[PDB]
Amino acid sequence: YECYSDVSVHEEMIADRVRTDAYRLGILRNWAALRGKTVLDVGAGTGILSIFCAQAGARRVYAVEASAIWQQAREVVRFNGLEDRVHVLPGPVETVELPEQVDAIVSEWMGYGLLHESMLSSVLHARTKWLKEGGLLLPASAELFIVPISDQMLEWRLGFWSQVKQHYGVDMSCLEGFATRCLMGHSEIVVQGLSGEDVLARPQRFAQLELSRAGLEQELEAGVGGRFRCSCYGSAPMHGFAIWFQVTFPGGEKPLVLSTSPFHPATHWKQALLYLNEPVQVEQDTDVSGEITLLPSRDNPRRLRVLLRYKVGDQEEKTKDFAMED
Amino acid sequence: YECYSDVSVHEEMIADRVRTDAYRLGILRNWAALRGKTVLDVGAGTGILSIFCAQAGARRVYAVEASAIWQQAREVVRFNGLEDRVHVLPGPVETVELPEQVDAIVSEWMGYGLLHESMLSSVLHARTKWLKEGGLLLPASAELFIVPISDQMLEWRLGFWSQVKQHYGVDMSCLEGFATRCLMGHSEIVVQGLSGEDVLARPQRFAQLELSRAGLEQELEAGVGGRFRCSCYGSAPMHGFAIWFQVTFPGGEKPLVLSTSPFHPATHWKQALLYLNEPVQVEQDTDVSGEITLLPSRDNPRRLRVLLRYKVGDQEEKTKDFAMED
Ligand SMILES: Nc1ncnc2c1ncn2[C@@H]1O[C@H](CSCC[C@H](N)C(=O)O)[C@@H](O)[C@H]1O
Numbered sequence A, B: 001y002e003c004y005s006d007v008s009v010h011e012e013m014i015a016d017r018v019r020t021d022a023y024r025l026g027i028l029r030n031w032a033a034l035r036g037k038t039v040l041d042v043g044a045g046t047g048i049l050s051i052f053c054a055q056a057g058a059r060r061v062y063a064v065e066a067s068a069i070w071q072q073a074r075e076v077v078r079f080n081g082l083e084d085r086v087h088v089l090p091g092p093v094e095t096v097e098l099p100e101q102v103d104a105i106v107s108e109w110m111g112y113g114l115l116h117e118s119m120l121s122s123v124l125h126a127r128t129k130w131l132k133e134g135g136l137l138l139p140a141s142a143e144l145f146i147v148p149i150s151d152q153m154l155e156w157r158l159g160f161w162s163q164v165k166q167h168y169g170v171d172m173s174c175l176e177g178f179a180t181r182c183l184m185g186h187s188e189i190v191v192q193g194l195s196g197e198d199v200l201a202r203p204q205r206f207a208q209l210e211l212s213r214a215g216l217e218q219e220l221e222a223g224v225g226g227r228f229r230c231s232c233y234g235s236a237p238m239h240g241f242a243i244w245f246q247v248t249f250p251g252g253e254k255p256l257v258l259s260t261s262p263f264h265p266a267t268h269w270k271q272a273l274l275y276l277n278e279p280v281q282v283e284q285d286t287d288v289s290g291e292i293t294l295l296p297s298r299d300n301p302r303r304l305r306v307l308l309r310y311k312v313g314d315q316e317e318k319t320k321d322f323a324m325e326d
């Protein structure tokens, strides 16, 4: 059967060493709590996290996987001789039947912008249904950050048309307006990796999601987020905002943090970019504030929508609402 | 209006210096034939080729463009003060009405694998309808090449699963079979850029398309191509074949060749790859032969289909038919 996408998606995740080592170490550092205990792996994929749990000493791991990759998970487990310790089960976690409640849930559920097409609702469903009172959740929480940015690659693309004269003796500088409207004037969230120098101010946490928190499902439906305020470092053309997340694994010891910040090593999640309609020049101490909400799209409840109200310096407040890139 | 794709596509073409300089110089080297003459630019895009023709001395250029980018073409021409020499006209070349027959047609019509979603039929329609007897076609011809290849990036992806043990202490080598079926076992043409070291034998020309040739439209409908034979250079895991094209501009003087070969500087066309179902080991002097045809797909006449019958060394003849990547 056709499976190009199957392999590519899992290759990308497992090739993401930042992600995979964070889970590797985040699970292993909890060995004392996992040794001789049971684990549910929500969305086991190739089974890698389930085998990490077994390495950490778990007696039984339930590796639940909804798509066809479950077949590969079964094979990886059998091949590593762990079929008596890791039970790969097909189908959605919402309807899986387990022989027992579990001591722990592990899951990599995070989407682009944390919440775009994420498995969070499934993890919470599984927590409610299958996790023992006082059970371990790995990771245990997630936090969302926002900061104003100047995107060097975007700047290059905006400038491209004025470079045509130098290359080919045809003046196309008149197309800057066009490029700006097309590249910035849309209402789509753009997934792109930034570096530290693109960041124009101190990043601000705008949401914290404690996965054990009661009523988190209802919060996610209504929208998560809040206000933010920061001050710019120097002269720059601000292009908009970047948002990203981190998730935290409890330690034995200090917690382990898997971060997708532009200051930290790159991951496959990159960051989620929210472009203004056009650049705005900022200076040292330019105040930038706003209010942001992440919520389900109307027409597709799995698709991320962002509501943003913002103010840059002395410019009037502006609204720009986004929906995730196709 | 939403125009992200508009700008990106044209940015990519104009940013492709190999392509754009080839047209720049290919047109300019024909200055003696263009000076004081008329040109039809089929699919003018941003108008760049039309302005090249004006620089070459054309009295009048008809810049015909079917999509919304015509608006930008109009602006570029007005901005360069050439509205009296370059006439940007909206809509498909098939229904454009010109005041006169033209002395020359210029067009960049080539698709991936030369013929995937190409404008060749439109160029030939325009040639028949609008070009004067003995008129100049730029470029004048196209040639197609095939060679057996070993794709280093594919090899890396095939090997990936056996590297997991080293990174994360989980053995996933058992997934090689899976990766191979998924990455090679499909029937899609893959667009990817190769280097000279991926090429396993002397490339063979398998088709030549003379754009003035009578009945070329009927050839394209029936399928273009032919047999080929070559001999491998050394020990390698052969993954399949790469195909590519060149187009030729007559000189004043020697012709100018725009090539998309893996031995030549990279272009946005890259090459079109035809993977075997699994790798085959070849050695010095391993004979590789076959027959290849490029033709319209059944369900979408603009989509490229490739019929391939091939024989590697002592292995029996095999058929594998492909259709272009979604
Ligand atoms: N409701 C659900 N129940 C079970 N599996 C699900 C699910 N929703 C998504 N999935 C699966 O969850 C996986 C998430 S990707 C993470 C895979 C693996 N745990 C790893 O870390 O490498 C995908 O394979 C997807 O098919």
Ligand SMILES: Nc1ncnc2c1ncn2[C@@H]1O[C@H](CSCC[C@H](N)C(=O)O)[C@@H](O)[C@H]1O
Binding pocket: B013, B014, B042, B043, B044, B045, B046, B047, B048, B049, B064, B065, B066, B067, B069, B091, B092, B093, B094, B107, B108, B109, B119, B122
């Ligand atoms: N039948 C047709 N008539 C007119 N324009 C067409 C056409 N089919 C495709 N096009 C246009 O032809 C262009 C080809 S891309 C090449 C654009 C430009 N000449 C350059 O070299 O940079 C696209 O803009 C496409 O919209």
